[PDB]
Design a protein around this ligand. Structure first.
Ligand code: SF4
Lengths: 49, 459, 118, 205
């Protein structure tokens, strides 16, 4: 949830001020190089268990 | 002192004229809710990216829901000098100068005043000035329109709020705000009166969560010393026991912060919670719910954690008694007293809106009291991370803020106490804002005799 | 003349020093809370060199229930009916430790649904 | 055993840091009443967090518990900055221990925590009942009156050391020095639980 907070504050530059649609755009960010993105990848690797 | 002399004066109650090896049992509590329904908010036993599909599910479900009411429950098109109020939601034909019912959802300003890998503060520069401006944008997923008027700040329809707006059009961009719409009332679940041999029924919504860090004794104080005995030994001579019913905590079972906690300090506060609950369980039966800072999914549909809140002395009671003296219930629950349906919220669902994510919609108890009035009225997406499940989040039966309306909603953990009652066209709803326990408690009786609430200052 | 209670309070006060909050009295005697108020008043009345005094809860309520720490003052409870005396403390602070106690004898008001072993 | 020196560690943590709190050797605003410093405390003991200092305290307790049969009396010495003279000497005991016997019976967790809570509350009582004048300029040091010890020579005799456990053990014998060896003495109620006889008193000047 802290990673999702970081991701939506990062993705605020593409919404105007909206916050409820921030979750899907935060989940669909794909950098090869971002220092929180891979931790969120393995976080969502955990939640399938 | 003369305080002792007051005890010397009051020799009339030698023993309160109780046998005192006779327990006078008070309540004939019905609790129709417990067994013969599935709880919608509860987990799936087979179950035991997510948010995206849920947002369109809320939007479409409300879209057919309020699609039934733009002329059935609101303005006739014969008025407005025959300005067409036909059910066009898209902004392509909103530009037609006759004002239609603009069935859309406001997502104008929702971001965070308090907080760096993603560089948030640089982005948050755009948040502060634009969010501070209170201007309202309406989105039916087809386009934004401007909103001005008096109800911009007085009526707090902050986010996820499907409304139909009525104003003299006068520009394609903007309206004034004369009227809003609502979902239809899912109908009156019958409030009973047991008129023949009236029980003088129990009246309780007491605990907002005994917020209990190990780090402070003052939160440990005002539990187990004034409470567990107001329910039974501290006496209003003797009517307090007659009013009190079955114990209701709402969230906040143990306060802690997740990044500083480990195994044994979690069991220290959970076994002292077990001490409290096994102390009060002979006196008053209890209904328990986790969900904001006690262990949870941190979602509104949240699986309540059995077998962890209790020591071995208390662990075997839920095995022995299935749901009667205690059962694990979720952050929302429909407690129904043969049709006195009441809803609970642990508070986080409205407290994040009230303090954490609010730059706008502000003209502070009398402001924040009406935010959960709004969240009751639209039955909508309050929080920022809703329903938060890897499997079976919402299967088109169980909205986290549901569609069947209660007679009282419980929300918790506010700064001050707030208790009003408002009547709507569907039913009557009493507003319950029980404060967080370190903010002076203000602990409350609820309902069910003449639908009346009574707080008492625990500090 | 119930000094049968008073010596039992005397060991727990003195021979070891863990405070009684309420529950030792109800465990020992199963007397009424009004009678427990009378007993604690009697202990206060027959105090001989208490190391420190207790503070009371107040029976007069006015939609307030406050442990008195402004002992001289009358904190919003001016037209006072009564006080229930408890929490006699050796220490600086009033904290007990909390424990499961025998209650099937001691429960003043029982459960609306009595628990079943099943 | 294993559980019994955990209880001794928690009891000495409560005893030591409570003496540190009531002598105002550290500022009281750093202290907060709590139950968790790495374990379960019997009472709410005012503990400052200060991880160098709590490292020092659990260090000293793991030093004293390392010997566990030479010690018949752990104690706390109180020294002013002004003089090295003893201001108070708080007495503790390791007499008739379970651990020396290594008896499995009896656990009695609630009963041993009950007698520990009693001895802590007695320590509270006779630590407020002496007054507060010159509340700053006080310090802390340990003292152990023990029946049969000398370990400090284990640094010597050209030993070759290989394991971290005995690295710790050489730190235990390195940290302890025998000193050279009354005015007032006050009573304290000790714990009288069966296997853990802790007959604890106090000394004044
Ligand atoms: S993961 Fe993507 S959205 Fe989140 S902070 Fe990094 S770059 Fe921004």
């Amino acid at each position: 949830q802290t990673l999702k907070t970081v991701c939506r504050t990062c993705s605020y530059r593409y919404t105007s001020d909206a916050g409820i649609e921030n979750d899907h755009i935060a989940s669909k960010c794909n950098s090869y190089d971002c220092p929180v993105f891979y931790s969120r990848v393995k976080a969502e690797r955990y939640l399938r268990d | 002192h003369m305080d002792a002399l007051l005890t010397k004066f009051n020799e009339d109650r030698s023993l309160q004229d109780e046998n005192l090896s006779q327990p006078r049992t008070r309540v004939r509590i019905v609790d129709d809710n417990l067994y013969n329904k599935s709880n919608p908010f509860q987990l799936c036993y087979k179950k035991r990216s997510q948010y995206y599909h849920i947002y369109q599910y809320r939007l479409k479900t409300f879209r057919e829901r309020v699609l039934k009411e733009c002329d059935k429950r609101w303005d006739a098109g014969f008025t407005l000098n025959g300005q067409l109020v036909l059910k066009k939601d898209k902004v392509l034909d909103i530009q037609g100068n006759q004002p239609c019912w603009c069935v859309g959802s406001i997502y104008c300003e929702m971001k965070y005043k308090p907080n760096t890998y993603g560089a948030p503060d640089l982005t948050k520069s755009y948040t502060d000035k634009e969010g501070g401006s209170d201007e309202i944008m309406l989105e039916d997923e087809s386009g934004r329109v401007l909103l001005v008027g008096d109800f911009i700040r007085s009526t707090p329809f902050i986010t996820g709020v499907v409304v139909g707006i009525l104003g003299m059009e006068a520009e394609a961009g903007t309206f004034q705000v004369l009227d809003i719409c609502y979902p239809t009332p899912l109908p009156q679940n019958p409030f009973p009166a047991p008129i023949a041999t009236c029980p003088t029924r129990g009246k309780i919504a007491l605990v907002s969560g005994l917020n209990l860090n190990n780090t402070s004794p003052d939160r440990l104080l005002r539990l187990e010393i004034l409470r567990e005995f107001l329910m039974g030994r501290i006496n209003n001579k003797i009517d307090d026991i007659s009013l009190i019913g079955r114990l209701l905590i709402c969230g906040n079972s143990v306060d802690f912060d997740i990044k500083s906690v480990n195994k044994d300090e979690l069991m220290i506060s959970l076994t002292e919670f077990s001490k409290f609950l096994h102390n009060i369980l002979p006196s008053i039966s209890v209904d328990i719910m986790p969900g904001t800072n006690d262990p949870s999914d941190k979602s509104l549909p949240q699986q309540p954690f059995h077998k962890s809140l209790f020591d071995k002395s208390l662990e075997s009671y839920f095995n022995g008694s299935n749901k009667e003296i205690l059962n694990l219930v979720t952050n929302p629950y429909e407690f129904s007293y043969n049709g006195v349906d009441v809803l609970a919220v642990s508070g986080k669902n409205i407290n994040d809106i009230c303090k954490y994510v609010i730059p706008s919609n502000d003209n502070d108890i009398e402001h924040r009291l009406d935010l959960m009035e709004c969240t009751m009225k639209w039955q909508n997406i309050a929080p920022t991370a809703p329903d938060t499940l890897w499997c079976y989040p919402y299967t088109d039966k169980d909205p986290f803020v549901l569609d069947k309306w209660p007679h009282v909603y419980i929300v918790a953990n506010q700064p001050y106490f707030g208790t009003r009652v408002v009547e709507i066209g569907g039913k009557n709803i009493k507003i319950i804002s029980v404060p967080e326990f370190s903010s002076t408690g203000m602990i409350i009786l609820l309902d069910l005799e003449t639908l009346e609430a009574e707080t008492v200052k625990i500090d | 003349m119930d000094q049968k209670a008073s010596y039992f309070i005397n060991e727990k006060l003195f021979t070891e020093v863990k405070p009684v909050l309420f529950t030792d009295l109800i465990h020992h005697l199963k007397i009424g809370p009004s009678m427990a108020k009378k007993l604690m008043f009697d202990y206060y009345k027959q105090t001989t060199n208490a190391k420190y005094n207790c503070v009371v809860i107040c029976c007069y309520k006015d939609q307030t229930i406050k442990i008195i720490h402004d002992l001289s003052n009358i904190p919003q409870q001016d037209s006072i009916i009564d006080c229930f005396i408890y929490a006699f403390n050796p220490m600086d602070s009033f904290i007990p430790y909390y424990d499961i106690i025998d209650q099937k004898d001691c429960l003043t008001i029982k459960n609306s649904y009595e628990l079943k072993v099943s | 055993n294993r559980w019994v020196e955990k209880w001794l560690r928690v009891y000495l943590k409560c005893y030591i840091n409570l003496i540190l709190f009531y002598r105002n050797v550290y500022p009281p605003q750093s202290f907060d009443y709590t139950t968790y410093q790495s374990f379960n405390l019997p009472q709410f003991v005012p503990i400052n967090r200060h991880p160098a200092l709590i490292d020092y305290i659990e260090e000293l307790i793991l030093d004293v518990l390392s010997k566990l049969t030479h010690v018949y009396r752990f104690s706390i010495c109180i020294i002013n900055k002004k003089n090295d003279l003893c201001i108070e000497k708080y007495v503790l005991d390791f007499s008739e221990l379970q651990h020396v016997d290594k008896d499995d019976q009896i656990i009695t967790e609630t009963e041993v925590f009950d007698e520990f809570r009693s001895s802590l509350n007695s320590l509270i009582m006779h630590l407020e009942k002496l007054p507060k004048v010159n509340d700053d300029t006080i310090t802390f040091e340990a003292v152990i009156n023990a029946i049969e010890l000398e370990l400090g020579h284990k640094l010597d005799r050209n030993r070759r050391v290989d394991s971290l456990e005995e690295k710790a053990e050489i730190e235990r014998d390195s940290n302890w020095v025998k000193c050279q060896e009354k005015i007032k003495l006050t009573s304290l109620v000790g714990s009288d639980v069966g296997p853990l006889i802790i007959h604890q008193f106090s000394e004044k000047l």
